[PDB]
Amino acid sequence: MKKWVCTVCGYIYDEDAGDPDNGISPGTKFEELPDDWVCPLCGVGKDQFEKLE
Ligand SMILES: [Zn+2]
């Protein structure tokens, strides 16, 4: 699946990994993250992530 980078702190959201400690199963597409999911390291919102190319 795809990866997305936090443009504030560099955290990589990996769709294959999800973010299960924060309620996000492995395989959750970025688009389907809840609207108020935030970077698990710096706390910024989804708008600050860029999809890896
Ligand atoms: Zn971050």
- DSSP letters of 12-27? EEETTT-BGGGTB-TT
H or E stretch covering 43: none
3-class DSSP assignment, residue 47: helix
For residue 43, the tally of other CB atoms under 10 A from its CB is 10
| Cα 2 to ligand 1 centre (Å) | 17
State how far the Cα of 32 lies from the Cα of 41, in Å rounded to an integer: 19
Of the candidate CATH numbers 2.40.50.100, 3.90.1640.30, 2.20.28.10, 2.30.30.100, the domain formed by 1-53 belongs to 2.20.28.10
| Cα 21 to ligand 1 centre (Å) | 16
User: How were these coordinates obtained?
Assistant: X-ray
